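Please complete every field before forwarding. Incomplete forms are returned to the sender.

SECTION A: IDENTIFIERS
Entry label: holo-316
Bound molecule: calcium ion
Molecule representation: SMILES string

SECTION B: INPUTS
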Amino acid sequence: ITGTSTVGVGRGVLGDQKNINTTYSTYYYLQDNTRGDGIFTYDAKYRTTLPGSLWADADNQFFASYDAPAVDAHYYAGVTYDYYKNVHNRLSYDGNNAAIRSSVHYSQGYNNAFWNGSEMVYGDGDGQTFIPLSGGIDVVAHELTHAVTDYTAGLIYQNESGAINEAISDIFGTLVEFYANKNPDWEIGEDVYTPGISGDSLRSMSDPAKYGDPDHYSKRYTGTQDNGGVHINSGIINKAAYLISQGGTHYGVSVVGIGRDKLGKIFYRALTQYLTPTSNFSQLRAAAVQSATDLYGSTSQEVASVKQAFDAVGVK
Ligand SMILES: [Ca+2]
Ligand SMILES: [Ca+2]
Ligand SMILES: [Ca+2]
Ligand SMILES: [Ca+2]
Ligand SMILES: [Zn+2]
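SECTION C: PREDICTED COMPLEX
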């Protein structure tokens, strides 16, 4: 929309109050002109026709419960944009400020959120398994990171390359949650998953086996479901990333942690300079080792901890 930039106020999915960048032109729209070529949030109105209509509001205050998922999709897309810009100098997902579009209220009782090749899509959940999925900052950042991966490595969405794809999104989703300091942890989707149960999540990076995923290459899923286990075998890489950052002893192999900032830098370089569409876990190890070598030198602790962490999860 052509109009005047302004700032509105609203409440997110979890009842927190936040300010959001909006655009005024008769109505107030969820259009943030301050980032790149814009952040645009649409209402799918409980259907599956996308994108639906650009969110319009009459008084620039977004406190209705119907508004909450849009507040958070809009706001958290902005925080994710800021993370990539400020920490990795990457301007939007294509590296040239492409506009970021999201649609909320997609379908009815839809327990998922996804990047569809051109935009983010968020279900409202069924109220028991999930609450509106844009309330999870890691969920939002996980899905927008698929857009980054599509424009850089192009990891295909199946088997080991698909599991790397998934793990990269869980890694950057987590790092965005730490960057915003929004009650951070190494779990995925705990803020919106099962509202009646405390302390669980969809996946854990510090201990993937807590929810049934493998934490070692010998335990990998080798069947055909979930596109060859893209959301299951990502646990092996997630555990490795957790060890690189936090350190630990896993199956008797001790890893000295190098922190989240170095983890983000090493995986960001591997993703954008050495991974290809069909990379497997073994190639990811080489990419991460070379990336750390590039950045810190071949005899550094950082390279040592990358190799130790892949050793600990059985990936050579
Ligand atoms: Ca209003
Ligand atoms: Ca958290
Ligand atoms: Ca989390
Ligand atoms: Ca829960
Ligand atoms: Zn994903």
